[PDB]
Amino acid sequence: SGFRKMAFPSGKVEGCMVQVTCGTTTLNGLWLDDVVYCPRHVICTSEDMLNPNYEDLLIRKSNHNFLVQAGNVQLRVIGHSMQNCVLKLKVDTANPKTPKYKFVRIQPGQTFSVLACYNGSPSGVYQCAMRPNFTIKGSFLNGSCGSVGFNIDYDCVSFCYMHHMELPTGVHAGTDLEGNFYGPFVDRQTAQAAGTDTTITVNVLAWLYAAVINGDRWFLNRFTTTLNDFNLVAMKYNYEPLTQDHVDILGPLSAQTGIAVLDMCASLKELLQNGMNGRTILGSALLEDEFTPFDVVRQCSGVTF
Amino acid sequence: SGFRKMAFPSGKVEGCMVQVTCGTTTLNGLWLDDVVYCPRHVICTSEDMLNPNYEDLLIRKSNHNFLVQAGNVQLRVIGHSMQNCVLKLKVDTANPKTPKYKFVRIQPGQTFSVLACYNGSPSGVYQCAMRPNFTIKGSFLNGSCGSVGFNIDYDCVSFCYMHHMELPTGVHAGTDLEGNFYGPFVDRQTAQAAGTDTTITVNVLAWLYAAVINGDRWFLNRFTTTLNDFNLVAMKYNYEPLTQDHVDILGPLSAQTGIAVLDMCASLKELLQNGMNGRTILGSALLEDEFTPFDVVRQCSGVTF
Ligand SMILES: *CC(=O)N1N=C(c2ccccc2)C[C@@H]1c1cccc2nccnc12
Numbered sequence A, B: 001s002g003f004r005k006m007a008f009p010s011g012k013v014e015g016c017m018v019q020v021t022c023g024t025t026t027l028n029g030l031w032l033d034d035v036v037y038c039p040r041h042v043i044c045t046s047e048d049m050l051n052p053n054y055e056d057l058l059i060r061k062s063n064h065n066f067l068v069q070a071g072n073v074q075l076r077v078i079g080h081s082m083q084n085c086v087l088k089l090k091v092d093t094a095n096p097k098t099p100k101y102k103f104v105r106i107q108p109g110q111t112f113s114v115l116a117c118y119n120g121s122p123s124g125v126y127q128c129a130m131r132p133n134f135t136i137k138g139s140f141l142n143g144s145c146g147s148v149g150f151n152i153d154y155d156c157v158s159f160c161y162m163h164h165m166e167l168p169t170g171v172h173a174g175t176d177l178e179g180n181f182y183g184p185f186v187d188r189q190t191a192q193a194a195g196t197d198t199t200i201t202v203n204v205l206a207w208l209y210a211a212v213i214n215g216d217r218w219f220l221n222r223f224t225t226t227l228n229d230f231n232l233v234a235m236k237y238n239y240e241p242l243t244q245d246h247v248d249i250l251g252p253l254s255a256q257t258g259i260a261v262l263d264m265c266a267s268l269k270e271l272l273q274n275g276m277n278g279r280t281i282l283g284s285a286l287l288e289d290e291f292t293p294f295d296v297v298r299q300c301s302g303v304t305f
């Protein structure tokens, strides 16, 4: 049946993308009800980014200094305020295309879809995981600021990420929809450290179950292991330790395939210790950790929205 | 800046997905203007699929035997006809959400986005390439029939694929929007051969340019080669031969990076002959061929729709 990195349909989110301009700077905004959300660094010039004092920079700005455009229509700004690293522009008209929505702060290891935008217009959609070190490995060029990450539950869009910056290492950093950064990052053009990244062990195991469901079974060995013995091998390979919560979450995929979680752990241990020996799993020559146990189940059931 | 497998925004295509039922069989249809397009095997039972005579099976069906539903609204069917392996149901109302559209028959090696649907509702979106052997490696469960593939050019949606079946090998087969299968496949439950698959050489080269644009340069060697010498190595590795048309298409990426196409060919030759030696390129331990030279340029310019 196949297994792919699948993003959510983006239609409900396209209808919310606007263009926000403040002087020389243009970026993307999110229009829900009568409020437009965008990164607060829309108020900065290139020079201001070296060491910005956002409170002082914002005081020089009035409602008329912000131009919001949705399609070829100019929204009128009647209020402005800073909430952490997000700017909230109150507009005179509610978005008629506002979907049912929630703002959520996702956990490291969880996935979401990104609708990459430029000048308020969508260009593409792809799936991402929030790394354990709170960075994402996306595809974002200059102008993509304000692009959002989200998940869908039938009719409800849960927004979880807003793009703010690229670190000098090439990975991406951003905030939740309340303006709080994921990780220790700050909205300033200064060299910042993301820290050691680790592999999402529960996600690699979920992907091994999807491989068995789709006929790939070569990696299955005759060994089993214990949670502590496996974790001795996980720490050496910078893999996050496995806990009984992760084993419980893997329950449905273990019940569907007849393979106990600890037996799948022993196979992962031998893959970590001996490599793939020129072989592939689900069309990949690496161990994949950007698929949660939920993403595996959704793709095998055909859950719709 | 990053490089990802990015699908087109799916909003314009979600508005066209309907559910089509004929007796016991339900699948997805595409509603454009006053016509619904769906696989003709919507008229079959499971037993009929072993050896269907579509002309005889369709004669037993009248307009009232087809139920078309878009959301919770039942469209009235006022005409029906078979065009190759596609059924065309004329309805009494035009889709108010019909985008600007074209039907196109794509070439092997070209890419497109798939909006996987179940019961007329979208579940996800992902990018695919039409393999040189006219199969696709997608993610499709029972009920996904009628799901469509497409590309977007600013405001115009070009539909290129309709999902019809999975081969016993796990790969997927389907038609263009005129009902003509890509490849030698037929809509029957019989064992079918896809034939030897080859690697899209021009796509692997485009991906090597994107790697250099994003800082990955380790694979660049001090060698060059000729078109015929490279093709001697391509034939041995089941890679499609490179021609001056492919070299011309790679022109912009060669001009952007300062690396002649034939020098990138020599690097590909050494990667084919010596492997990756435990290293990765753009987060992959395999040579990627599902990105066209156009997909690389779009992702480095930020082209919007
Ligand atoms: C996310 C994004 O588009 N940008 N982030 C930028 C940044 C610069 C210094 C420190 C942190 C973040 C620059 C770039 C950007 C933002 C807003 C408007 C733009 N217009 C043109 C080009 N780049 C940008």
Ligand SMILES: *CC(=O)N1N=C(c2ccccc2)C[C@@H]1c1cccc2nccnc12
Binding pocket: B025, B026, B027, B042, B049, B141, B142, B143, B144, B145, B146, B163, B164, B165, B166, B187, B188, B189, B190
């Ligand atoms: C594409 C698709 O969903 N299906 N294709 C099927 C097929 C069977 C035999 C030979 C060729 C193709 C079966 C499956 C399907 C189609 C239509 C309705 C369904 N309802 C439930 C389950 N599967 C299907």
